[PDB]
Design an enzyme around this catalytic site. Structure first.
Site, PDB file in Angstrom:
ATOM      1  N   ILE A 267      10.132  10.525 -11.949  1.00 38.71           N
ATOM      2  CA  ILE A 267       9.537  10.736 -10.631  1.00 38.71           C
ATOM      3  C   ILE A 267      10.251   9.897  -9.576  1.00 38.71           C
ATOM      4  O   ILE A 267      10.573  10.384  -8.485  1.00 38.71           O
ATOM      5  CB  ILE A 267       8.030  10.426 -10.682  1.00 38.71           C
ATOM      6  N   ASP A 278       1.412   8.574  -8.562  1.00 39.51           N
ATOM      7  CA  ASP A 278       1.101   7.412  -9.382  1.00 39.51           C
ATOM      8  C   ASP A 278      -0.093   7.781 -10.248  1.00 39.51           C
ATOM      9  O   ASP A 278      -1.170   8.076  -9.712  1.00 39.51           O
ATOM     10  CB  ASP A 278       0.775   6.203  -8.499  1.00 39.51           C
ATOM     11  N   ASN A 281      -5.131   4.033 -12.115  1.00 39.86           N
ATOM     12  CA  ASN A 281      -6.497   3.655 -12.438  1.00 39.86           C
ATOM     13  C   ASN A 281      -7.322   3.691 -11.157  1.00 39.86           C
ATOM     14  O   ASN A 281      -6.789   3.559 -10.051  1.00 39.86           O
ATOM     15  CB  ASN A 281      -6.540   2.257 -13.051  1.00 39.86           C
ATOM     16  N   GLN A 295       2.959   3.916 -16.738  1.00 37.14           N
ATOM     17  CA  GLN A 295       3.601   4.498 -15.556  1.00 37.14           C
ATOM     18  C   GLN A 295       3.202   3.791 -14.258  1.00 37.14           C
ATOM     19  O   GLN A 295       4.060   3.458 -13.427  1.00 37.14           O
ATOM     20  CB  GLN A 295       3.280   5.992 -15.475  1.00 37.14           C
ATOM     21  N   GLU A 296       1.905   3.557 -14.052  1.00 38.48           N
ATOM     22  CA  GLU A 296       1.481   2.953 -12.787  1.00 38.48           C
ATOM     23  C   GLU A 296       1.986   1.522 -12.660  1.00 38.48           C
ATOM     24  O   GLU A 296       2.549   1.133 -11.622  1.00 38.48           O
ATOM     25  CB  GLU A 296      -0.042   2.977 -12.650  1.00 38.48           C
ATOM     26  N   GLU A 297       1.767   0.714 -13.698  1.00 38.96           N
ATOM     27  CA  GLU A 297       2.152  -0.689 -13.636  1.00 38.96           C
ATOM     28  C   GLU A 297       3.652  -0.836 -13.436  1.00 38.96           C
ATOM     29  O   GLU A 297       4.100  -1.697 -12.671  1.00 38.96           O
ATOM     30  CB  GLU A 297       1.703  -1.408 -14.905  1.00 38.96           C
ATOM     31  N   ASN A 410       2.770  14.306 -16.669  1.00 39.90           N
ATOM     32  CA  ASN A 410       1.576  14.435 -17.517  1.00 39.90           C
ATOM     33  C   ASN A 410       0.514  13.411 -17.103  1.00 39.90           C
ATOM     34  O   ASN A 410       0.180  12.472 -17.828  1.00 39.90           O
ATOM     35  CB  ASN A 410       1.941  14.263 -18.986  1.00 39.90           C
ATOM     36  N   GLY A 412      -2.613  11.410 -16.614  1.00 44.71           N
ATOM     37  CA  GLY A 412      -3.776  11.102 -17.430  1.00 44.71           C
ATOM     38  C   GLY A 412      -3.691  11.505 -18.889  1.00 44.71           C
ATOM     39  O   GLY A 412      -4.733  11.626 -19.543  1.00 44.71           O
ATOM     40  N   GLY A 414      -1.996   9.952 -21.510  1.00 41.21           N
ATOM     41  CA  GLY A 414      -1.732   8.962 -22.531  1.00 41.21           C
ATOM     42  C   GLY A 414      -3.030   8.428 -23.089  1.00 41.21           C
ATOM     43  O   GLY A 414      -3.769   9.143 -23.773  1.00 41.21           O
ATOM     44  N   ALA A 415      -3.332   7.172 -22.766  1.00 44.48           N
ATOM     45  CA  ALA A 415      -4.558   6.555 -23.246  1.00 44.48           C
ATOM     46  C   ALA A 415      -5.805   7.259 -22.728  1.00 44.48           C
ATOM     47  O   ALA A 415      -6.869   7.127 -23.340  1.00 44.48           O
ATOM     48  CB  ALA A 415      -4.583   5.080 -22.841  1.00 44.48           C
TER      49      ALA A 415
END
Ligand SMILES: Cn1c(=O)c2[nH]c(SCCN3CCS(=O)(=O)CC3)nc2n(C)c1=O
Length: 500
Positions: A267, A278, A281, A295-297, A410, A412, A414-415
């Site tokens: 991205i 992003d 959370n 990804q976000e962190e 993708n 949301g 992963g965890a």
């Protein structure tokens, strides 16, 4: 076979697609902390107002330099100054300094990762440069806060539609304070005020023994080294957007838009000038200041100006997003999570717009966390994700011709347990309703690239509207999920239903 669909060269990008920006001006819904009349390319922006002005209330950031920042009473700002204006030669010196104005947390805050980074990761010359140059320069810009951030910073509270535009230099002073953990009322585990806001002080970056914390610290010190050596000259805008009128998805007659889907690229590198998602959370930034490193962190570490959103951005409700325009990339990286590594300093070559903002737009939208895989096909939950993405993609008052493509992936999945094929289609429908094209990165999953492309072309060739597709999602829930993992997968169900 590396990519499918519309060539990425045909997708809209900033700045080429943008409209002339209006005059930058403060207003009831736009806080501007610099002298617009003196804003010039290549010049450090001048703070407005000239002399520090303080607000200490429940609608504004509580600044560490406020005369109301007291400790049973003495001046906490005076204490911070005395503590930080000491020579550091060993990591214990920095721990002791931070704890002098955080005595209540002296038995709660662990500094193992800071100690290990300094003593056990860095070589001697790197450690000497850290405590002889970088840390003293960070102290100086932190303590300069009252001359740099002269204007009160409003909280972007829930349900507010409001923007803050500030200088990269102002962000650097605030983040240096966050590193030294100086922000008051932001620390207690059981606090009332600010309980709905993310952590901002960096103390949890110093705790524990993960091999990830040193990489996080390398990434952040790269930033701090850069911005203390030469002040950045641009601006950054933070906009909280909260929508009330959401589409009647079953009745939406809009057609799908264009798709480019690829299993190579990222991205942030291949979506230059696009609206970059992003995978957030609801507390924007997630675990950036603690243990998280997906990804976000990662994005908040290589573009650290994103981190300051945590100072003033309340937890996102279901109908809200945060849009950040102008953050700069200071680091390159490889891997993720347990394989994340800082690679090198990055020279950002993004153009700046007429407000001296890097032409980089990032939107934080938080997906839901599903305890059970089948929960996400419940209509209330599909509509929720549709409306969240729609809010993140919509720009009221802008022609579609002036809207960049959405660069995403993708979200949301992963965890948080999301199904990639469902979340891809949800984002495609939301982008269609917002009249934006989609650039989709599958992160090495070639089969998923093919599947998303095949479904998209199937639906567009048969001229299905957004509402046509949404009702197929509802059918899938009722026929395969409600009374049920499912017997039939989503995309096969859709092909069969339409071909029937
Ligand atoms: C499109 N895209 C990603 O998906 C991505 N992930 C990460 S790190 C967390 C790993 N993970 C999250 C969701 S996943 O499980 O679906 C697949 C991968 N960095 C990423 N970048 C830069 C990206 O451009």
């Amino acid at each position: 076979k590396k990519w499918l669909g519309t060539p990425i060269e045909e997708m809209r990008r900033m700045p080429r697609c943008g409209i002339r920006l209006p005059l930058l001006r403060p207003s009831a819904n736009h806080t501007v902390t610099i002298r617009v009349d003196l804003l010039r390319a290549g010049e450090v922006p001048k703070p407005f107002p000239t002399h520090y002005k303080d607000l200490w209330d429940n609608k504004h950031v509580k600044m560490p330099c406020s005369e109301q920042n007291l400790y049973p009473a003495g001046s906490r700002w005076e204490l911070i100054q005395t503590a930080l204006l000491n020579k550091f030669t060993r990591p214990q010196n920095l721990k002791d300094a931070i704890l002098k104005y955080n005595v209540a947390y002296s038995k709660k805050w662990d500094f193992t990762a800071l100690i290990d980074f300094w003593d056990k990761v860095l070589e001697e010359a790197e450690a000497q440069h850290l405590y002889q140059s970088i840390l003293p320069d960070m102290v100086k810009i932190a303590l300069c806060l009252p001359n740099i951030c002269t204007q009160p910073i409003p909280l972007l509270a829930a349900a507010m539609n409001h923007s803050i535009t500030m200088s990269q230099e102002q962000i650097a002073s605030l983040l240096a304070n966050a590193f030294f953990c100086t922000f008051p009322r932001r620390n207690a585990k059981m606090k009332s005020e600010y309980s709905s806001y993310p952590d901002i002080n960096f103390n949890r970056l110093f705790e524990g023994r993960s091999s990830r914390k040193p990489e996080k610290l390398k990434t952040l010190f790269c930033y701090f080294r850069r911005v203390t050596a030469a002040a950045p000259t641009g601006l950054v805008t933070f906009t909280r957007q909260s929508l009330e009128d959401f589409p009647e998805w079953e009745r939406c007659e809009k057609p799908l838009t264009r798709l480019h889907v690829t299993y190579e690229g990222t991205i942030e590198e291949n979506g230059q000038g696009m609206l970059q998602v992003d995978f957030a959370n609801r507390f924007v930034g997630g675990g950036v200041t603690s243990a998280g490193l997906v990804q976000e962190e990662i994005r908040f570490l290589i573009n650290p100006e994103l981190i300051i959103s945590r100072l003033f951005t309340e937890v996102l409700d279901h109908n809200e997003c945060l849009i950040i325009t102008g953050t700069e990339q200071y680091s390159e990286y490889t891997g993720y999570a347990e394989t994340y590594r800082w690679s090198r300093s990055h020279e950002d070559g993004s153009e700046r717009d007429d407000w001296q903002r890097r032409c980089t737009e990032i939107v934080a939208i938080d997906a839901l966390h599903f305890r059970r895989y089948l929960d996400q096909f419940v209509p209330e939950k599909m509509r929720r994700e549709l409306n969240k993405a729609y809010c993140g993609f919509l720009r009221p008052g802008v022609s579609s011709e002036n809207l960049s493509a959405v660069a995403t992936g993708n979200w949301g999945c992963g965890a948080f347990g999301g199904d990639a094929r469902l979340k891809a289609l949800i984002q495609i429908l939301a982008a269609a309703a917002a009249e934006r094209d989609v650039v989709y990165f599958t992160f090495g999953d070639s089969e998923l690239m093919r599947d998303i492309y095949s479904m998209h072309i199937f639906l567009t060739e048969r001229k299905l509207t957004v509402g046509d597709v949404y009702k197929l999602l509802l059918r899938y829930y009722n026929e395969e999920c409600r009374n049920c993992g499912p017997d039939i997968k989503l995309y096969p169900f859709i092909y069969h239903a339409v071909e029937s």
